[PDB]
Design an enzyme around this catalytic site. Structure first.
Site, PDB file in Angstrom:
ATOM      1  N   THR A 140       0.825  -1.840  -0.013  1.00  0.00           N
ATOM      2  CA  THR A 140       0.351  -0.280  -0.225  1.00  0.00           C
ATOM      3  C   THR A 140       0.837   1.193   0.135  1.00  0.00           C
ATOM      4  O   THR A 140       1.813   1.281   0.411  1.00  0.00           O
ATOM      5  CB  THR A 140      -1.477   0.019   1.179  1.00  0.00           C
ATOM      6  OG1 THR A 140      -2.065   0.993   0.506  1.00  0.00           O
ATOM      7  CG2 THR A 140      -0.632   0.057   2.524  1.00  0.00           C
ATOM      8  N   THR A 141      -0.090   2.488  -0.525  1.00  0.00           N
ATOM      9  CA  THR A 141       0.409   3.854  -0.277  1.00  0.00           C
ATOM     10  C   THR A 141       0.064   4.770  -0.030  1.00  0.00           C
ATOM     11  O   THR A 141      -1.209   4.878   0.179  1.00  0.00           O
ATOM     12  CB  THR A 141       0.755   4.039  -2.111  1.00  0.00           C
ATOM     13  OG1 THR A 141       0.076   4.138  -2.479  1.00  0.00           O
ATOM     14  CG2 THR A 141       2.599   3.496  -2.360  1.00  0.00           C
ATOM     15  N   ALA A 174       6.137  -1.825   1.594  1.00  0.00           N
ATOM     16  CA  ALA A 174       4.935  -0.350   0.384  1.00  0.00           C
ATOM     17  C   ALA A 174       5.710  -0.476  -0.611  1.00  0.00           C
ATOM     18  O   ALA A 174       5.052  -0.251  -1.182  1.00  0.00           O
ATOM     19  CB  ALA A 174       5.646   0.630   0.836  1.00  0.00           C
ATOM     20  N   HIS A 217      11.485   9.948 -14.473  1.00  0.00           N
ATOM     21  CA  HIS A 217       9.970   9.451 -14.731  1.00  0.00           C
ATOM     22  C   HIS A 217       9.580   9.540 -15.845  1.00  0.00           C
ATOM     23  O   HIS A 217       9.580  10.417 -16.029  1.00  0.00           O
ATOM     24  CB  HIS A 217       9.359   9.132 -13.007  1.00  0.00           C
ATOM     25  CG  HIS A 217       9.812   8.246 -12.463  1.00  0.00           C
ATOM     26  ND1 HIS A 217      11.012   8.743 -11.258  1.00  0.00           N
ATOM     27  CD2 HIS A 217       9.606   7.222 -11.720  1.00  0.00           C
ATOM     28  CE1 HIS A 217      10.929   8.016 -10.339  1.00  0.00           C
ATOM     29  NE2 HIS A 217       9.816   6.642 -10.462  1.00  0.00           N
ATOM     30  N   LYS A 229       3.982  11.629 -14.317  1.00  0.00           N
ATOM     31  CA  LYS A 229       4.146  11.720 -12.831  1.00  0.00           C
ATOM     32  C   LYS A 229       4.150  13.060 -12.187  1.00  0.00           C
ATOM     33  O   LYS A 229       4.844  14.051 -13.059  1.00  0.00           O
ATOM     34  CB  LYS A 229       5.518  10.951 -12.397  1.00  0.00           C
ATOM     35  CG  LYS A 229       6.529  10.991 -10.657  1.00  0.00           C
ATOM     36  CD  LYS A 229       6.963   9.695 -10.519  1.00  0.00           C
ATOM     37  CE  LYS A 229       6.791  10.231  -8.861  1.00  0.00           C
ATOM     38  NZ  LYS A 229       5.855   9.427  -8.238  1.00  0.00           N
TER      39      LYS A 229
END
Lengths: 241, 239, 241, 241
Positions: free
Chosen positions: A81-82, A105, A136, A140
């Protein structure tokens, strides 16, 4: 061969499904908040209803907490999860008493290894200037990346003083030894590259991790699942899995 | 080989002296602010008898009064001070002698700019990010070389906008943006990267300097080519 | 919506099929040298027989030249080949008098640009030593890659003397100016990276292309096809499509 | 401010002199096998005659053993040599009983750090393919470099059945997990770059050391000296200094 239950069927568990099947595993069920037509697997609302399952892979979000609130299942759980983690981690903490539970995470074993390699490098290179770069894709928005922040945190834990320097343009200050320049490259479809530069006297050391596909996270979860299935009950991270 | 007049004698013309002699050239004279130095000292360019060329790495205060005088000599000028008035005087002198000017004397950097010029129209769907790295003593950012590369892109690409700091900016990249990044650390002589990031592929072009000798060597290379030129104003583009 | 005829059904056109269908195009036929039962499309032996095709996508090799030798069809052709090309290109020239024909060795606009950037670089960097490196996944058997050979060929066309050097460990001879060192890195799942190094006195220039996914080639072909269907007859490359 | 005695005044100790003075250290003497008037420091024949030296830095060769044969000095010694080491090391062992003695064939601290970082990386990345690349100037004849060999030796100590692969051109063999590809780039005036590539499934980790000048070896000896003066008698290398 593992029989895998997927908690959630967003982009990440769609990757898990494809890669697991490639490896000879079988997806025996999906639990999702909004059960979708064209999800090519048997849909469930409770972990206990998915008999045969050896493990569950859960790329979590707040809307996927619900199956973890049941008290009638005992199954190895691989959970990512974030952002908000506290409520989830409290529940995983409880579940780890009765089954194997793995949490990370970030599901990339490569990124985990990168952090450990950085940890080894820092005390060896305390005279060297550190600069952090991440690149990235052009979609983003946040900068810097969470992974850069994680690397920065490793350095902070091994240094007395650290000051982040986000932009040198028209800054017009002389570099000080505590400074760590932070550089966020955006472009194309770059999945994620992270570089730690150590710059010394007429020599540099660079440590660079480059992700080719978000499959690294899906694969990370699957490989974690493969190890977890044999573990005793308890809470596991990449550190003790 | 050549007989060279050195205008100014700081670190850079000291490099030129060492490198020129290694190539078989000889330093026949130096014009300096406050003289010390193993060469003959002059106050005027006309005074230097057998000079083939002058290589200048100095400042306006020393150079400008020398240019305002009556002489005929090929000039390799690297002085980066007061560009507007300098180019006005160099323009006038180029009517009567070969005159070479470059703010950056590295031939490698010139090649990088030409390679970049070729790349841009070929990669119009690619996002451009510019990175430069220099030693920990460099204060200004970005480097003048990065700015030169950016200027090349601007000439070939419409509506370019520079983006310097994405931290907490919270905007999505736009195709006309060029991200600019200045790495500082150690003793890095100078590294410049142009990244072109397209759909599922990248092209990177990277120049890395190992020594400031590249600039001294570049000025010598320019001088060697300039002595074989007619009158006119030259840069690496037309030399 | 294009109706696509696939010439060949190896890994690349399998990828073309998946990506084309994702885009809403339809695969209306396949022509294979040896038809396979596992090929989930209607098999044909002649382009003229493929009713309603809008375009053919052809990742060619010598065993797939055959349908291009028929003289009873008119169809937009998107053709790639990594090996020898003279025989093929002669035939494509003839076909282009009666239909649109697009050729690219690799079907990557990016790789095409790389070769042109290299071509601009070479005459500028006369006093620089050239070294060529490529990196590919651990399943790649041939070395060096065809793309490296393509880059090497560009350099040969712009220099008077070139000698390839493959193994300095075996040779133990000092570098000669005509030498171009060739290096083939293999590891992991690396899609494909090619570097040209120009090494001069106290400076280097590096030009590096990195592919993130074989999708660049398959999407390259599809995008070329999408465009070619609306072009007049004739021969096209990335330079003039 | 360290007072440094230079044993030898070849290219390397000329570098030490400049760097030491930059750092605010002082060269208090030079012992040369054949003293030259161009040497801008007080010439001596015996370590004991040097007034107030804190340390000697000795880039040795067979002609510079002589001052180590005196029995009337006690001084921290920082020593390097290439090739034949037996006689020298035997003497340094004897001296190490009575004063701090440091020996490293390779005086670059960055290179030492690289080897330690590599040692940390290997057991964390055992599912990653390893490729070693080194780049040097166009005058270097032997391939691969001694430094690449030292990195390869580190990996051999931490794996099993490692096999070097020096050239893949026309080899036509599939990579095996125990293979380490070895790549020797030669060009221009490149001082020395060493890269370790770890290539995994959809991710790579690279660790790269790049030398800007031979000052790294001179600086390494000075850094070793600064640490050695605070050690008791003994024989030290970068591993235990």
């Amino acid at each position: 061969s593992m029989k895998i239950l997927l908690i959630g069927y967003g982009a990440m568990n769609q990757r898990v499904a494809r890669l697991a099947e490639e490896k000879g595993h079988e997806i025996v069920g999906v639990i999702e908040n909004t059960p979708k037509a064209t999800t090519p697997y048997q849909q469930y609302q409770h972990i206990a209803d998915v008999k045969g399952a050896d493990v569950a892979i859960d790329f979590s979000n707040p809307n996927l907490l619900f199956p973890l609130l049941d008290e009638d299942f005992h199954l190895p759980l691989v959970v990512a999860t974030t952002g908000e983690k506290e409520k989830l981690l409290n529940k995983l903490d409880e579940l780890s008493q009765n089954m194997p539970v793995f949490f990370s995470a970030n599901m990339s074993y490569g990124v985990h290894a990168l952090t450990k390699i950085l940890a080894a490098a820092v005390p060896l290179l305390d005279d060297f200037d550190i600069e952090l770069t991440e690149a990235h894709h052009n979609k983003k928005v946040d900068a810097p990346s969470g992974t850069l922040e994680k690397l920065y945190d490793v350095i902070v834990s091994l240094k007395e003083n650290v000051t982040p320097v986000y932009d040198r343009h028209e800054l017009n200050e002389k570099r000080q030894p505590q400074d760590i320049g932070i550089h966020s490259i955006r472009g194309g479809t770059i999945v994620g590259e992270h570089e730690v530069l150590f710059a010394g006297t007429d020599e540099t050391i660079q440590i660079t991790h480059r992700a080719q596909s978000k499959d690294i996270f899906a694969n990370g979860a699957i490989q974690a699942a493969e190890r977890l299935v044999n573990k005793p009950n308890g809470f596991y991270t990449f550190d003790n899995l």
